[PDB]
Amino acid sequence: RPRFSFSIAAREGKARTGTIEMKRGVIRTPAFMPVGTAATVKALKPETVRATGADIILGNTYHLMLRPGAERIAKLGGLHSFMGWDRPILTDSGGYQVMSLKQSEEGVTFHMLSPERSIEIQHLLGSDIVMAFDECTPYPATPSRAASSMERSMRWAKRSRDAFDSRKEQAENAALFGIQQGSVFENLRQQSADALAEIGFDGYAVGGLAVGEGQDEMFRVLDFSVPMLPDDKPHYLMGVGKPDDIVGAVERGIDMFDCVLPNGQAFTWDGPINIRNARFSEDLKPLDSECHCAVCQKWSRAYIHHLIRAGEILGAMLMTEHNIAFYQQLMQKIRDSISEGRFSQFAQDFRARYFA
Amino acid sequence: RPRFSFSIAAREGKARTGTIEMKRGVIRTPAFMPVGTAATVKALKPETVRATGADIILGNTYHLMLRPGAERIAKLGGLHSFMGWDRPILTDSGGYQVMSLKQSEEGVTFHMLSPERSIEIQHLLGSDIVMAFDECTPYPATPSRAASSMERSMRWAKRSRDAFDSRKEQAENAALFGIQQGSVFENLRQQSADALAEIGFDGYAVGGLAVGEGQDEMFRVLDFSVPMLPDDKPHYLMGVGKPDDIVGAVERGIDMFDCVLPNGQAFTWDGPINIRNARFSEDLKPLDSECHCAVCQKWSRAYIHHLIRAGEILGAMLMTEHNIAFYQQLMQKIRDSISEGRFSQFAQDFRARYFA
Ligand SMILES: CNc1nc2c(CCNCC3CCCCC3)c3nc(N)[nH]c(=O)c3cc2[nH]1
Ligand SMILES: CNc1nc2c(CCNCC3CCCCC3)c3nc(N)[nH]c(=O)c3cc2[nH]1
Ligand SMILES: [Zn+2]
Ligand SMILES: [Zn+2]
């Protein structure tokens, strides 16, 4: 395989379906990327993650630089070897989680992160898709503050790019994505998009959303922001999100998603359910009537209700496998409907039923 | 298969290896029976339990009568269907755990358990191997108190037997084991053994041990107690135990074991290790050099050390799979060495290395 190749197989409106080819594997797009806690996808063996249909997962840079340490993981052979996932890994750059838990143009101490260190840590982990080091601008933000933050991020983006390119092995085997900022302001989004295209990246993320503004406002910003990005590269909406968020974002040109979202909340095609609710204590149906996951093949709502109420580890295991598989099934239905030119109908159908 | 058939294939001294045939499957003896928490074997799918080599597991009567309720599980199709294990299940009778957390000849309230209710609960759960309702006598015990307790248990044993026999479906499809009591006193053990043989059971457990007396005293009591039981039926040592305990007990005629034993303790053929210890932070070897389990095929000590320190669910999953597989491998080596008439040599070899 090549280091990085994104190809678009089919389109419908702003929506696209295609593939990202990387040395460690292929990523079908639009993609959902399950997120790790600490060199693990919570309560799942990698084989199980893969069985749900995931093509790529997210590494947790912020936690790993802290424990076990990026340098220790590198010594040990890299994240892939360490956790036993041999497919692509995306790593965020760490500042989002820092501010989420001393800032300056050099970076952030909390103990220290700058564009250079962030890129180096992601290299030590052996990430396939490296995110630029950015500032995720708080919401709401005044235009002055948003512009100031955006500008710093773009400077940081240039520094990320140079750092990455400076390291031969990283540059030859990994990909680098830039992250657009600008809060909810179109001119700032445009300035950010332009800055990033000028530097040039393998992919473009839309940063600073999913931070309290709500779906209506997120969709509004996506409406003008995603077309600002290079059409011919992947578009990643960081931190999104619920099923309905994903569908709308794909309608607006987004190709990649991560969220910690997929406790007793189970996703179903009739909307989410909380399996702790007493109404499931004797319900012998699976979590969802149509889901093809192994959980839904073998265990009832009543059983999983018991496990979660009882605080049992198997309950977390089963709920997590189901929910990550539900997300992959969602993505698969999205990919298929776009390929077949019936994605707008799928979205309408999905929403009618999910919100009935 | 028959309801119950125990056959002894080979012997060496007091040790035996054979099979228990039951309608839901065959149990190779000497057997290790992994214990459930709340209709689950902690952090393991049933397929995984089976993959480690387990032939039978233990249901947790005390927890299940409380949550979810025996009646609810029956309504839902029984424990087997509920948790997704289709092989034999052994259920203890509940009083051990009660006293472990108002006693009278009728039973115990805590809310209520008697021989009749205990047998009924185990039936509602759909247990294959039903334990008599007994009193586990505290240690140390004066001879008066031990005798009094033992006597009650034997009365309770007769009541268990009648209750079981009174229920056609239970009697035709399940097995009933009596439990010997008598603390550490030989005459009491003998009186208990005689009482139980007179009633007649499918199997005989040695109760009241592993309750603080220590291995030397446990082995001493087993030395005279196990030969008191019918030779031609299985002998079950309740609550034991560590690997070395198991080996010694098999040398003394025990065929069946359960313990909650198989936190960061990992069993190895060179003895146990605590994987949380700093010396494993960068150790790339598997938990054990020879173990054939999937964990040891794929992940390092360093990784599992990280997971456990980090409090990650995958760490519990992996440690539990390894430890239950280690126990099954121990049992398999025991079974093979007895079949081949080299079990005393295996025991000496095992101990020399495990305690080096
Ligand atoms: C939930 N909302 C949201 N997330 C954003 C994220 C994080 C995406 N999730 C990454 C994983 C989180 C769990 C641990 C492993 C990494 C953002 N990240 C960056 N760098 N920049 C953002 O603007 C940015 C904006 C974000 N908005
Ligand atoms: C650990 N020591 C020990 N255990 C004994 C047990 C319990 C065996 N373990 C059963 C499982 C425990 C975890 C939950 C599921 C049931 C004993 N049980 C009974 N009825 N009688 C005993 O004398 C008896 C004596 C015991 N000594
Ligand atoms: Zn499912
Ligand atoms: Zn192992």
UniProtKB/Swiss-Prot annotation, chains A, B:
<keyword id="KW-0671">Queuosine biosynthesis</keyword>
<feature type="binding site">
    <location>
        <position position="291"/>
    </location>
    <ligand>
        <name>Zn(2+)</name>
    </ligand>
</feature>
<comment type="subunit">
    <text>Homodimer. Within each dimer, one monomer is responsible for RNA recognition and catalysis, while the other monomer binds to the replacement base PreQ1.</text>
</comment>
<dbReference type="InterPro" id="IPR002616">
    <property type="entry name" value="tRNA_ribo_trans-like"/>
</dbReference>
<dbReference type="GO" id="GO:0046872">
    <property type="term" value="F:metal ion binding"/>
</dbReference>
<feature type="active site" description="Nucleophile">
    <location>
        <position position="258"/>
    </location>
</feature>
<protein>
    <recommendedName>
        <fullName>Queuine tRNA-ribosyltransferase</fullName>
        <ecNumber>2.4.2.29</ecNumber>
    </recommendedName>
</protein>
<keyword id="KW-0479">Metal-binding</keyword>
<comment type="similarity">
    <text>Belongs to the queuine tRNA-ribosyltransferase family.</text>
</comment>
<dbReference type="InterPro" id="IPR004803">
    <property type="entry name" value="TGT"/>
</dbReference>
<feature type="binding site">
    <location>
        <begin position="92"/>
        <end position="96"/>
    </location>
    <ligand>
        <name>substrate</name>
    </ligand>
</feature>
<feature type="binding site">
    <location>
        <position position="208"/>
    </location>
    <ligand>
        <name>substrate</name>
    </ligand>
</feature>
<dbReference type="GO" id="GO:0002099">
    <property type="term" value="P:tRNA wobble guanine modification"/>
</dbReference>
<feature type="binding site">
    <location>
        <position position="296"/>
    </location>
    <ligand>
        <name>Zn(2+)</name>
    </ligand>
</feature>
<feature type="binding site">
    <location>
        <position position="322"/>
    </location>
    <ligand>
        <name>Zn(2+)</name>
    </ligand>
</feature>
<keyword id="KW-0819">tRNA processing</keyword>
<dbReference type="InterPro" id="IPR036511">
    <property type="entry name" value="TGT-like_sf"/>
</dbReference>
<dbReference type="GO" id="GO:0101030">
    <property type="term" value="P:tRNA-guanine transglycosylation"/>
</dbReference>
<comment type="pathway">
    <text>tRNA modification; tRNA-queuosine biosynthesis.</text>
</comment>
<feature type="region of interest" description="RNA binding">
    <location>
        <begin position="239"/>
        <end position="245"/>
    </location>
</feature>
<feature type="active site" description="Proton acceptor">
    <location>
        <position position="92"/>
    </location>
</feature>
<keyword id="KW-0862">Zinc</keyword>
<feature type="binding site">
    <location>
        <position position="293"/>
    </location>
    <ligand>
        <name>Zn(2+)</name>
    </ligand>
</feature>
<keyword id="KW-0328">Glycosyltransferase</keyword>
<feature type="binding site">
    <location>
        <position position="134"/>
    </location>
    <ligand>
        <name>substrate</name>
    </ligand>
</feature>
<dbReference type="GO" id="GO:0008479">
    <property type="term" value="F:tRNA-guanosine(34) queuine transglycosylase activity"/>
</dbReference>
<dbReference type="GO" id="GO:0005829">
    <property type="term" value="C:cytosol"/>
</dbReference>
<dbReference type="GO" id="GO:0008616">
    <property type="term" value="P:queuosine biosynthetic process"/>
</dbReference>
<dbReference type="InterPro" id="IPR050076">
    <property type="entry name" value="ArchSynthase1/Queuine_TRR"/>
</dbReference>
<feature type="binding site">
    <location>
        <position position="181"/>
    </location>
    <ligand>
        <name>substrate</name>
    </ligand>
</feature>
<comment type="function">
    <text>Catalyzes the base-exchange of a guanine (G) residue with the queuine precursor 7-aminomethyl-7-deazaguanine (PreQ1) at position 34 (anticodon wobble position) in tRNAs with GU(N) anticodons (tRNA-Asp, -Asn, -His and -Tyr). Catalysis occurs through a double-displacement mechanism. The nucleophile active site attacks the C1' of nucleotide 34 to detach the guanine base from the RNA, forming a covalent enzyme-RNA intermediate. The proton acceptor active site deprotonates the incoming PreQ1, allowing a nucleophilic attack on the C1' of the ribose to form the product.</text>
</comment>
<dbReference type="Pfam" id="PF01702">
    <property type="entry name" value="TGT"/>
</dbReference>
<keyword id="KW-0808">Transferase</keyword>
